[PDB]
Amino acid sequence: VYPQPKVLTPCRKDVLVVTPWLAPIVWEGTFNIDILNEQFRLQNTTIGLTVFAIKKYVAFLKLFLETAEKHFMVGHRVHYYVFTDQPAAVPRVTLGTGRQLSVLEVGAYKRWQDVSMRRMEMISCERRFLSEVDYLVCVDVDMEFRDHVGVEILTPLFGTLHPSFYGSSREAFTYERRPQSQAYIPKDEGDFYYMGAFFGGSVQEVQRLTRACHQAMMVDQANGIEAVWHDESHLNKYLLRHKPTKVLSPEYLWDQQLLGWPAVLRKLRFTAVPKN
Amino acid sequence: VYPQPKVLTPCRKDVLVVTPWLAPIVWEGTFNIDILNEQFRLQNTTIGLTVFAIKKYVAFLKLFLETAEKHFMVGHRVHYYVFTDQPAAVPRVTLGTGRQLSVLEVGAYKRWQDVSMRRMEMISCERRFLSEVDYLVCVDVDMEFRDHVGVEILTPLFGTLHPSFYGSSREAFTYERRPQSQAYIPKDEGDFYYMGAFFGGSVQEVQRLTRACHQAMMVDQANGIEAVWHDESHLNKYLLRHKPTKVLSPEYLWDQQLLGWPAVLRKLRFTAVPKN
Numbered sequence A, B: 001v002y003p004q005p006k007v008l009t010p011c012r013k014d015v016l017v018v019t020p021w022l023a024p025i026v027w028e029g030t031f032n033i034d035i036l037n038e039q040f041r042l043q044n045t046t047i048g049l050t051v052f053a054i055k056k057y058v059a060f061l062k063l064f065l066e067t068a069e070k071h072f073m074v075g076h077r078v079h080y081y082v083f084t085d086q087p088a089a090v091p092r093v094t095l096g097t098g099r100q101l102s103v104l105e106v107g108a109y110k111r112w113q114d115v116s117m118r119r120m121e122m123i124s125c126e127r128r129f130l131s132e133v134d135y136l137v138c139v140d141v142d143m144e145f146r147d148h149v150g151v152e153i154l155t156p157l158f159g160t161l162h163p164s165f166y167g168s169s170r171e172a173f174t175y176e177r178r179p180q181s182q183a184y185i186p187k188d189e190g191d192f193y194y195m196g197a198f199f200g201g202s203v204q205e206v207q208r209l210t211r212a213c214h215q216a217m218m219v220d221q222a223n224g225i226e227a228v229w230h231d232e233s234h235l236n237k238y239l240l241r242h243k244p245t246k247v248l249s250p251e252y253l254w255d256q257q258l259l260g261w262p263a264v265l266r267k268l269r270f271t272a273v274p275k276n
């Protein structure tokens, strides 16, 4: 038993809550979490969360993991996949029931561009995800959960609105604009500017996306060019041509230090941790 | 190249455009049809449309079919399935390319309750739909198309808001309220009141729904009760427990004679034809 939705009273009148291809844009006030939780529990949903913690970024794991335990898919099955060059540095964090963590040991790439960039290659490690989880959520590790992040996000394919660019026009989007690059998006094209720090979907859709972006980055390399924002450029080219089935609002990727807390954000759910 | 969606300017601020389980509610102004058409054409989508024309209701087929040719899934593959007791009375209507019509001969049930009611049994004729179409759309025949009805509606499972009840509270919903009936919905339960005249989905979801409603009506019969609005009662019980993935606005099921043309309806797409 819950409040009756009323067709002639919108939830939110201040923000766009659906894209022009009829994908929900997920804001507080758009969903009843009780309904969604029941739907996902009935399927015994398992959500995998992938995080890279290479070199000094192992320092961010403790708060990342502690805060995920408090706010991320609570009540559902969760499998954390920690990709690191330092397995001994992964902190032991006590997990709730139905939750588990695996440490995947990987190589440390020399430059930060290639660390960020090789995530796509590294996520795509294929049949282990297909058997173990229903959805994959791929995030930066230099972050903390401050409020609910739940099954409202889950769908075949989702991206997240970049918090610096949601109120902006498309010509201002820092898409890749050199036609030499696989990430190239013309000045008159574009729906949104998605951030590379939080995307996901079904295992099948995430494997497609990561495979494509990896294949697209190798083509750029063989051609002597590096997309202007690296994986995020290719992520934006993919999601232009294969549109997400949900879009997360900036409630899901924010920085209060840089941007404050505007009234249009009723919750700040997943935020940046200060770094040098 | 199309207008950029703007996250801080909603399309429609006058109506709810998403349900609390994050299913789009389809109103004019929520979708860009150019995007949707390309997505569905890329999959070579075929849409089946089922219509019963038993006894005197063969008189409605000509206008139904002529108007569908003008407004229903134009540019896409369409297969009409005309269920009738009078195959010779089906009018020959000239079809656009990629469009076809089959006549399925059925028995005429004695009462109108059972004619309306046995559609569920009759739709569920199973493997022929699975092979021939991707989606099934199930409508009344006493109607005409007056404006676009397209791939914006397509999704795994959809119902349509009853035009008499969209502005109403749930206690006013004419759900079945006797616990004796499989269609029983408590006074404090309910999202919307859907009309039996326009529902659909993927072939798999429509076969599930029609099978369930058929199984539920047989149980009611064996127990000596007939749901208050017959198939529509069971349709509402199904869609309460298995929530639709899109909901169509009343633009998709209207009667201008009874209800006029209110400002909140920017288009009147599929309407009732006067009958005695």
Ligand SMILES: O=c1ccn([C@@H]2O[C@H](COP(=O)(O)OP(=O)(O)O)[C@@H](O)[C@H]2O)c(=O)[nH]1
Pocket: A051, A052, A053, A054, A055, A056, A057, A112, A115, A116, A139, A140, A141, A142, A197
């Ligand atoms: O030395 C590094 C650099 C990057 N990262 C990973 O790559 C992500 C993206 O890089 P970063 O957070 O530095 O990018 P930014 O948020 O500053 O643009 C990080 O969150 C980590 O998951 C890493 O593990 N070690």
Ligand SMILES: O=c1ccn([C@@H]2O[C@H](COP(=O)(O)OP(=O)(O)O)[C@@H](O)[C@H]2O)c(=O)[nH]1
Pocket: B051, B052, B053, B054, B055, B056, B057, B112, B115, B116, B139, B140, B141, B142, B197
């Ligand atoms: O004698 C009948 C009665 C009903 N119908 C079919 O059942 C649908 C629902 O019945 P009707 O339209 O009479 O219901 P209403 O719209 O008046 O509630 C009709 O549209 C036809 O498709 C039919 O073919 N022959």
Ligand SMILES: OC[C@H]1O[C@@H](O)[C@H](O)[C@@H](O)[C@H]1O
Pocket: A162, A164, A174, A195, A196, A229, A232
């Ligand atoms: O223009 C895109 C850039 O926006 C910055 O605000 C952000 O720190 C970068 O990571 C990148 O997303």
Ligand SMILES: OC[C@H]1O[C@@H](O)[C@H](O)[C@@H](O)[C@H]1O
Pocket: B162, B164, B174, B195, B196, B229, B232
């Ligand atoms: O209360 C439900 C009823 O509403 C009437 O307006 C309609 O004609 C009936 O077919 C049935 O839907």
Ligand SMILES: [Mn+2]
Pocket: A140, A141, A142, A197
């Ligand atoms: Mn980061």
Ligand SMILES: [Mn+2]
Pocket: B140, B141, B142, B197
């Ligand atoms: Mn009718």
